[PDB]
Ligand SMILES: *[C@@H]1O[C@H](CO)[C@@H](O[C@@H]2O[C@H](CO)[C@@H](O)[C@H](O)[C@H]2NC(C)=O)[C@H](O)[C@H]1NC(C)=O
Ligand SMILES: *[C@@H]1O[C@H](CO)[C@@H](O[C@@H]2O[C@H](CO)[C@@H](O)[C@H](O)[C@H]2NC(C)=O)[C@H](O)[C@H]1NC(C)=O
């Protein structure tokens with residue numbers, strides 16, 4: 001046996017022969033570090049009984065267990081395999097108990113499959129019977145993608161395991177963790193998944209959300225595939241250098257989806273087609289967000305707001321953390337320390353800004369006739385709390401306000417209760433969006449105020465290697481009861497159900513609007529309802545570096561609006577770290593500076609009205625705002641098609657194996673390469689320049705570099721930003737709010753490829769109405785240059801912006817001098833525009849031009 005293919009048979013304790021012999025496994029302690037001493041024997045597990053049965057969707061098989069004896073509880077001796085050829089590029093199979101129904105994730109988006117197996121499959125499926133294995137191979141080249149034969153199927157009531165071989169070590173995904181790198185190098189590694197309030201640090205623990213999806217790039221041709229496990233029980237994913245991946249969960253069923261694509265982007269698209277594509281954000285939520293834990297008082301918050309406005313910082317959103325509340329209680333504000341809160345929200349709104357308020361799931365149970373607490377009284381009347389195991393007494397835990405009950409957002413009535421709470425509170429404070437925190441769900445006591453009973457749910461046969469080693473640690477009892485089921489099965493779905501309910505509440509509080517929801521805890525599909533932030537990081541250079549894989553991974557997961565706390569939540573931030581972080585932060589899809597309680601100010605203007613940090617921050621935030629039309633269009637593509645927004649180099653440059661492990665750089669979509677300085681003291685970064693034409697964003701000049709590692713010179717006020725030849729970038733002259741910026745003239749940056757061609761697009765709608773896409777109320781146009789001609793072509797034209805918008809500048813990069821430029825509108829000339837040419841940089845700027853948005857034009861020149 002090859003040692004890299006040994007599947008660990010003692011995942012639960014240090015390995016010993018006595019245990020090994022007792023489990024019927026193989027013993028060989030001679031291997032290298034982490035190679036399993038005790039591993040499963042070749043014939044251990046299930047076999048197919050009888051024949052496979054063709055069905056309309058695919059096939060079923062009956063699986064039978066070769067009689068072993070209990071290790072992690074009751075074995076399931078008769079297992080049903082059901083396989084559905086759902087689409088040409090999506091395969092679904094589940095392993096269930098033949099004789100008993102079991103817990104299955106009640107996903108809000110994924111539906112059951114009905115009717116017939118798809119035509120023109122890109123994959124073929126093979127079943128072996130003695131012993132059972134399942135294999136999925138790519139038809140075009142016979143590449144084995146999924147292959148469970150490396151290990152057994154284990155299917156006990158509270159221990160389910162399946163492994164698959166992998167065709168490469170280019171493996172990306174799984175969460176929520178701090179992986180540190182982007183590519184899983186497949187050395188021996190276990191990643192637990194169980195939603196938990198814990199620090200995203202170098203310890204590799206389970207964090208706030210649960211994401212089983214991974215993507216595998218098979219080879220340099222781009223051919224890629226994805227695997228998703230639809231399971232919400234505590235689990236761990238085990239990676240080894242075979243290469244192989246094992247899923248090990250403590251409940252539910254093994255419900256697997258396999259996705260094939262021609263490129264990594266197609267895998268992501270196929271995955272999001274199944275679980276749900278991300279919500280199109282409000283355009284304002286694409287601006288800069290400022291926040292902190294404990295301004296303490298409204299005067300303090302107002303002071304920070306005011307110094308940043310005085311600095312002319314682009315700055316759309318102010319968040320209000322739990323300090324705004326009356327003693328940290330939802331749906332109240334502090335009438336002393338936040339006296340005049342409603343007038344402040346008026347001032348924000350008058351200045352074109354928005355207010356997002358934090359809300360916690362926990363509701364104080366402290367209500368008397370003397371002092372009534374409305375949210376608690378109303379929720380108690382509606383009977384919408386999580387109950388203890390008796391099924392009828394609301395479970396009591398403890399969070400910020402003291403003893404608390406927790407809403408059962410899996411109950412449709414709880415969304416009606418929650419909605420009414422927000423409508424009532426909105427009458428007092430006119431917030432614009434909602435930040436849902438602590439929704440793992442996070443509890444200051446273990447399980448409940450009376451702890452947790454000793455039983456198979458709170459104290460299961462096997463516990464994955466989760467932080468602290470017990471399931472109910474800093475959360476609800478596992479035998480707590482909700483409408484969807486027991487906490488043991490649905491713990492990982494709490495924040496997901498909270499996002500669903502909060503979206504539902506927004507249909508009433510902000511009629512017809514997207515608003516903005518930011519969530520901490522997620523499950524697969526949470527991006528349909530919410531943005532995400534990476535949690536309570538620290539102001540260290542390690543945290544800055546670790547943020548890039550975190551953002552990339554959440555883009556795989558369909559949560560493209562994701563970012564960390566810029567400058568670092570915990571700790572006072574050093575000026576140099578915060579300056580570098582603000583430079584990079586300008587380019588996170590979610591861009592928020594947030595700071596923990598008690599630490600020194602880290603809002604940009606706190607560093608000084610004429611500090612290098614403030615000047616640089618404003619500079620790069622203005623570039624971010626200039627490029628918002630391009631970013632917004634990327635979000636349109638994420639929402640409508642399922643493309644990523646922050647994109648790894650490898651998704652565009654997979655033919656080049658030097659991109660496969662790049663994680664210190666990333667792209668906005670296909671065209672914009674972002675290269676931060678990420679090292680303390682550094683004024684350079686070692687960077688990779690992919691195989692394309694690149695132009696410096698600011699000067700427009702073509703770099704000499706191509707398909708090579710470079711030492712990019714980046715002084716204290718610089719981040720690397722390059723535009724890819726072949727792409728046209730729509731821009732809008734910036735201002736300090738998107739309310740104002742959206743009224744400004746537009747521009748095009750044409751970055752020419754080797755053949756002097758480029759293409760691009762622009763999506764434009766009202767920026768706020770929900771379902772402008774489903775209802776087809778938008779503008780979509782396409783730009784294409786070849787090679788003495790720009791064509792502006794209109795493809796969807798059901799929104800005309802009443803602000804009279806037009807392109808009034810075209811920048812062309814990598815071009816010989818354009819002469820005698822003409823503008824035709826629907827073939828009719830024409831107005832003669834101004835052209836400025838830099839012969840040294842090879843940049844032309846066309847100005848004194850007025851291409852109305854939503855109209856077709858041709859712009860021609862000669863050389
Ligand atoms: C938690 O316990 C409460 C009672 O404290 C249950 O409330 C029931 O609510 C339904 C639906 O509104 C009513 O028709 C019942 O009459 C209520 N029962 C009682 C005994 O008051 C609630 O169902 C429980 N929730 C869960 C998840 O089990
Ligand atoms: C940026 O937006 C501001 C609004 O905050 C504008 O400052 C306003 O616009 C017009 C000038 O055309 C004035 O009548 C307003 O009084 C201006 N200021 C204020 C304080 O309201 C500004 O024009 C915008 N500028 C850009 C670059 O688009």
Ligand SMILES: *[C@@H]1O[C@H](CO)[C@@H](O)[C@H](O)[C@H]1NC(C)=O
Nearest residue numbers: 199200201202203204205542
């Ligand atoms: C792991 O956690 C401990 C606290 O449990 C902390 O002190 C330590 O710094 C963490 N390690 C890393 C590598 O971040």
Ligand SMILES: *[C@@H]1O[C@H](CO)[C@@H](O)[C@H](O)[C@H]1NC(C)=O
Nearest residue numbers: 365366367368370371402403
């Ligand atoms: C409940 O709130 C009241 C009103 O402020 C307070 O006096 C009392 O101590 C609280 N009870 C608990 C259980 O802390």
Ligand SMILES: OCCN1C[C@H](O)[C@@H](O)[C@H](O)[C@H]1CO
Nearest residue numbers: 292293321322358437535536
């Ligand atoms: O347990 C503390 C609760 N919250 C944790 C969040 O992750 C953080 O962003 C927020 O500032 C803080 C106060 O609301």
